[PDB]
């Protein structure tokens, strides 16, 4: 059984990457809602994604105090409905943000002259929305999750038989569309990215910018694709009895870092770039 | 709903429809502001690059993409209000008489001046050192040397990373460098990384003069799309 | 000769300066501390206008306060509807940089021009219905900064050669030219009665000519930087001078001597308009700080700010009868304040 | 500025035809066109409108289906298909340019138009059909409505044409405001249902038919038409 | 001569703007807000009028 080592994991670590989304993420809406600089399509791409990150957040603490006090659900079911669906959502909405911020600015710089097809103001919103829409849709099923009582305790985000027949149907859909598909854009992306950037035959701007796409991409293949795999072979082959005691471990590690990546993303795509440490700079001294 | 109100309103979607249009190209263009003194090859320039009106637009197209090259030469000599209005251009080219010495102490002037502006301190400046064979043949004969006006040259060394081009007199590439490494110290001058400077030396008959600006705004726009973008 | 002439130079405007102190009976602060204050002025944006492709460099009110003149720094012009938003006339330039506009008194005819150095005059009221150059002058050795019209024959234009010129529509040539400033004029503005304008330029001083008499009968020299902009008071007594200092300062031409600063601390980005209400009252201005500003013409306190530009304001412009204020930015959206 | 229609002459019952207009001196697709009818012996009768850039077309009530308004820009010209062509259809085209924006004045020049033989909507009522008046004295012709014109942005949609004997309508008043190319004889003044056609000093140019239009709706209806003879 | 010339010319437009008349700052101060008062109801940015007259 794993449970004990969860009920001891997940209260600290949840809490802790609460806090640190927080704390991020309420500073970067405070700047992109700015007016100081302008309003660009990657702006809005950029605030879609915080926002998707900061409900991510809002919905983390609430699973940790469940996991503190024994796997004890208090809150009434259409509470547990709602947290399951606004985990998934938010998460596959910032998955598809930084896939459309990976194919935005790999636009810009492999086309830099011609085919300005990038530049936008209202078809990013346009987009945001179809994504926000379509996925909100799509993971509607996930909200007949039942309270699942027993006994004197709520089994709320725990796996059981009921939650089962649905499981084996969506869940390879998400590898697919949701991991698979994005991995294989990113990676298509940024290598077309690092290659024009190596294209120079004969640079102080150019090594920053190298090293800003390998970190994404090793941050990236190290916290979704593992997840996704072990959640995949640990339902795929989901029996009465035990948990084979190993499988659900990684499924867990897994899960935590995967979460943490609420905290990785804004600092990546915003905090470092100095497009946006300007305007941070300038929100933070004005008064 | 009053029926002239309604003809009014589709006049202006056709009107739209038109500054729609007009917009793609706009969008699509890029704004080049050529800029030069009187002595500064400028207009050799502009007549090389073929692909009391204060302001002259040439179009030129280059790898499939047009370029609109603003020079500027019929207006008085003071420049420092109505550069403003050459804000968001894809880059300014200077030129700069490499040869005549007693000129280029004018001509570094002006190019700190138009480098440390206020409006244009996020626009890029490329620099076009033309007139090279003149420079090459005056370093050569001796007669003119520019330790007379500038001191630094007799205790300057010629760069070890140089990239002298075949059958350039050992003078020759000492006093190009020279030049370049000055203008770079101008420029790198309070740039931050936010507007970099792009020398290169132009010859008076060299075709390939085009070509230099469309590698220098290339690289010009890659570093914006990289910067706009959050990528370095 | 040369020595005496400087000495006689400086005694004049000594004598200028001590005459002008002996008239200073006291500030205009003294006086606009008993009337009551005005309280904040918060105006709402009524029209948004997405049209224009570049900067907006110029705008103007004609003698219908429903048509709204604006020019974008891609040598277009577009006259709006500013009550129904809809663009009542687009007129492609053949100049690019175009940083002029006015719209006839008489509603038929416009101006504009730019670092062309030719001031292009276009009907709007032609048989033909579609917009024909009526008038493109030439003459100026300099980038042209503001254009005004004094009727339906007559208007004057200020270019950067430091002389500001009346030309004639019918002949197209110059009316009248004036002498040159020791700047470049960077704006212009008409008084009531159309017989005296007042012009900035460059030089920290601005000149009171005739359209009678090339002459200025006051030079005002009182200002720290450039000035960019320069309106006249609706009685047509005084007027307001912006340079790019951030600080305003409105001139009286009876006093011949400036009544009051309009500066702030906060406030370090230079200005780029100004404009006064139909009472004058309210005086309006546009700074480098992606804002406009309206302060009490007496009382000297921000009364408002409008924020709802993203890029540098350039120009600002209230109407004749005062229901609303326009607005063009840099970027390329003319907003309606009311 | 010159409109030149042509295609008029003898047509069968039941046949069809195509009334072709030339437009030149101005341009054409800036420029709104409409063509109307006017019967032998009777008064104007609006029959179809074709917008800017073909991007808008109406017909009235009667034409609608038989009559078909096309316009090529490119050649700066004006197209009118009819089918099935009825009896009534007996009558004089005019083709009309009109251009709407603040302070316009929209029907401002009128073809000479061609001649056609064969073989609830505002309605616009006059009072008298002709009064005759000599030079030197004023005129003041009224005209009633069924509706009131006055619309909620405060513009008078009413139109004043004068067709002469051998010319077409001209304009005289399209919002009190005078038209272009009009002395400052006529002037106009009412209410939004009643109106009133003042003509202070009268000219042997002045004599012929004034009819009265509304444009607040897109279908329109003229009037019975005042006449005016020395 | 240029020197001079605009030597000169200064002088002259000194003078000629001297004897200009110049009245003390209270008159001029009094009047402005004489006519700024005048026109206090007829100014829709100074004074916000009903939506009607919009
Ligand atoms: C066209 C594209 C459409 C877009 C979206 C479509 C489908 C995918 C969307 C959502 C589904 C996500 C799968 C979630 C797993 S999460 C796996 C489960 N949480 C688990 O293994 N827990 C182990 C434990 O507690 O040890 C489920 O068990 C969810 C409920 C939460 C829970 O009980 O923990």
Redesign the pocket.
Known sequence: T?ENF?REFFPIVYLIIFFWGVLGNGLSIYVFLQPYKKSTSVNVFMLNLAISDLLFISTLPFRADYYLRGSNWIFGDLACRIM?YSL??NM?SSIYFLTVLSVVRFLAMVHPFRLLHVTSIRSAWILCGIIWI??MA??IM?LD?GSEQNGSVTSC???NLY?IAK?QT??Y??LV??CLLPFFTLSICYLLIIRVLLKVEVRVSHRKALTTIIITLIIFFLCFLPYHTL?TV??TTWKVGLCKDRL?KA??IT?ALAAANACFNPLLYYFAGENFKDRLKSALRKG | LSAEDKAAVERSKMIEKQLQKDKQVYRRTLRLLLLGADNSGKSTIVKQMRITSGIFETKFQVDKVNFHMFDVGAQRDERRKWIQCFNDVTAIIFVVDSSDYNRLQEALNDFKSIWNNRWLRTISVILFLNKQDLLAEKVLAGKSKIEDYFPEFARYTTPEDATPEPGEDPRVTRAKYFIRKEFVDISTASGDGRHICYPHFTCSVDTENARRIFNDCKDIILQMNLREYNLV | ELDQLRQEAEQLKNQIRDARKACADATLSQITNNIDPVGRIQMRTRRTLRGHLAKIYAMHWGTDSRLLVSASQDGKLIIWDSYTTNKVHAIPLRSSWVMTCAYAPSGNYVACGGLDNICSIYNLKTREGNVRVSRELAGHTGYLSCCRFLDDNQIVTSSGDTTCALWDIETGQQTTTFTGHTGDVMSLSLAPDTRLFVSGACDASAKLWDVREGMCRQTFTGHESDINAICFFPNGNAFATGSDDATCRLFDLRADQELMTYSHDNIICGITSVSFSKSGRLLLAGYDDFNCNVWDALKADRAGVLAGHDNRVSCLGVTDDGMAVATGSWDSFLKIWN | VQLVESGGGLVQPGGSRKLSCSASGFAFSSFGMHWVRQAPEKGLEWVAYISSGSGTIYYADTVKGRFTISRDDPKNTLFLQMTSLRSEDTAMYYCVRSIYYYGSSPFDFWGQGTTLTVSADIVMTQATSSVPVTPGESVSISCRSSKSLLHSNGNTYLYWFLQRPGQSPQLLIYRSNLASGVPDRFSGSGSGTAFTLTISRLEAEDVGVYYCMQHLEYPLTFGAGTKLEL | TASIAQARKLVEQLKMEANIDRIKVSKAAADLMAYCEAHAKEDPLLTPVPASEN
Do not use: D, F, Q
């Open positions: 794993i969860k399951s998934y959502v596959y379509l996925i799509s993971s996930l999750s985000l725990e796996l939650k499981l969506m869940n859909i998400a569309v949701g959640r640990h339902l659900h499924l867990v899960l």
